[PDB]
Every structure is written in C-alpha cells, then in structure tokens.
Design a protein around this motif. Structure first.
Motif, PDB file in Angstrom:
ATOM      1  N   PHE A   9      53.138  33.372  90.295  1.00 29.70           N
ATOM      2  CA  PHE A   9      52.506  34.381  89.455  1.00 29.70           C
ATOM      3  C   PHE A   9      53.164  34.057  88.118  1.00 29.70           C
ATOM      4  O   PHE A   9      52.058  34.198  87.199  1.00 29.70           O
ATOM      5  CB  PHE A   9      53.252  35.660  90.003  1.00 29.70           C
ATOM      6  N   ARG A  10      54.129  33.853  87.654  1.00 33.22           N
ATOM      7  CA  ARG A  10      54.672  33.390  86.606  1.00 33.22           C
ATOM      8  C   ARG A  10      53.864  32.203  85.851  1.00 33.22           C
ATOM      9  O   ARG A  10      54.003  31.815  84.895  1.00 33.22           O
ATOM     10  CB  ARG A  10      56.280  33.168  86.507  1.00 33.22           C
ATOM     11  N   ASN A  11      53.127  31.590  86.767  1.00 35.44           N
ATOM     12  CA  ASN A  11      52.496  30.320  86.250  1.00 35.44           C
ATOM     13  C   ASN A  11      51.094  30.686  85.731  1.00 35.44           C
ATOM     14  O   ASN A  11      50.436  30.245  84.742  1.00 35.44           O
ATOM     15  CB  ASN A  11      52.466  29.321  87.605  1.00 35.44           C
ATOM     16  N   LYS A  12      50.541  31.814  86.491  1.00 33.27           N
ATOM     17  CA  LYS A  12      49.164  32.287  86.101  1.00 33.27           C
ATOM     18  C   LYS A  12      49.172  33.108  84.730  1.00 33.27           C
ATOM     19  O   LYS A  12      48.506  32.799  83.851  1.00 33.27           O
ATOM     20  CB  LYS A  12      48.581  33.268  87.175  1.00 33.27           C
ATOM     21  N   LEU A  17      49.033  33.524  78.195  1.00 35.53           N
ATOM     22  CA  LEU A  17      49.688  33.531  77.126  1.00 35.53           C
ATOM     23  C   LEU A  17      49.279  32.410  75.921  1.00 35.53           C
ATOM     24  O   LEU A  17      48.867  32.989  74.922  1.00 35.53           O
ATOM     25  CB  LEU A  17      51.273  33.351  77.377  1.00 35.53           C
ATOM     26  N   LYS A  18      49.308  31.395  76.255  1.00 41.22           N
ATOM     27  CA  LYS A  18      49.169  30.250  75.156  1.00 41.22           C
ATOM     28  C   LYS A  18      47.838  30.662  74.586  1.00 41.22           C
ATOM     29  O   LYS A  18      47.384  29.762  73.808  1.00 41.22           O
ATOM     30  CB  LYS A  18      48.949  28.884  76.039  1.00 41.22           C
ATOM     31  N   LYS A  19      46.875  31.370  75.360  1.00 41.57           N
ATOM     32  CA  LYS A  19      45.640  31.618  74.881  1.00 41.57           C
ATOM     33  C   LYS A  19      45.477  32.350  73.537  1.00 41.57           C
ATOM     34  O   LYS A  19      44.742  32.257  72.883  1.00 41.57           O
ATOM     35  CB  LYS A  19      44.828  32.339  75.879  1.00 41.57           C
ATOM     36  N   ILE A  20      46.297  33.693  73.835  1.00 42.72           N
ATOM     37  CA  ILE A  20      46.230  34.458  72.512  1.00 42.72           C
ATOM     38  C   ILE A  20      46.905  33.738  71.385  1.00 42.72           C
ATOM     39  O   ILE A  20      46.768  34.011  70.043  1.00 42.72           O
ATOM     40  CB  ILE A  20      46.979  35.684  72.654  1.00 42.72           C
ATOM     41  N   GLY A  21      48.154  32.966  71.589  1.00 43.91           N
ATOM     42  CA  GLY A  21      48.950  32.202  70.714  1.00 43.91           C
ATOM     43  C   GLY A  21      48.117  31.605  69.858  1.00 43.91           C
ATOM     44  O   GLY A  21      48.255  31.120  68.695  1.00 43.91           O
ATOM     45  N   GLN A  22      46.853  31.247  70.316  1.00 45.69           N
ATOM     46  CA  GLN A  22      45.808  30.275  69.575  1.00 45.69           C
ATOM     47  C   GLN A  22      44.738  31.153  68.712  1.00 45.69           C
ATOM     48  O   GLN A  22      44.448  30.695  67.781  1.00 45.69           O
ATOM     49  CB  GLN A  22      45.078  29.457  70.549  1.00 45.69           C
ATOM     50  N   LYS A  23      44.976  32.276  69.358  1.00 41.67           N
ATOM     51  CA  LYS A  23      43.704  33.289  68.400  1.00 41.67           C
ATOM     52  C   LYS A  23      44.504  34.005  67.118  1.00 41.67           C
ATOM     53  O   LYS A  23      43.890  34.219  65.969  1.00 41.67           O
ATOM     54  CB  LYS A  23      43.517  34.319  69.222  1.00 41.67           C
ATOM     55  N   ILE A  24      45.953  34.209  67.189  1.00 44.36           N
ATOM     56  CA  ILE A  24      46.524  34.924  66.040  1.00 44.36           C
ATOM     57  C   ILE A  24      46.764  33.789  64.960  1.00 44.36           C
ATOM     58  O   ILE A  24      46.716  34.098  63.936  1.00 44.36           O
ATOM     59  CB  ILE A  24      47.926  35.272  66.570  1.00 44.36           C
TER      60      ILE A  24
END
Length: 32
Positions: A9-12, A17-24
């Motif tokens: 779970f904590r893997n999915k 997470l790293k996805k939004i950190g790329q948008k901001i």
C-alpha cells in the motif's frame, strides 16, 4: 497477511506523491 497488504500500500501511494511534487515546482518559480 495484513503486513503484505500494508507494505504494498505505502508503495502505491508513494508513486502519486512524486507526481504532484513535479507539478508544483513548475509554478513556484513563477508565483514564488
């Protein structure tokens, strides 16, 4: 059995997470 499920779970979520950190980081330079 609960463990095997929790670990994966904590893997999915970690991926989303790293996805939004790329948008901001793209707007920050413009806004702040």
């Amino acid at each position: 059995g609960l463990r095997k499920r929790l670990r994966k779970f904590r893997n999915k979520i970690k991926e989303k997470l790293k996805k939004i950190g790329q948008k901001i980081q793209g707007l920050l330079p413009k806004l702040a």
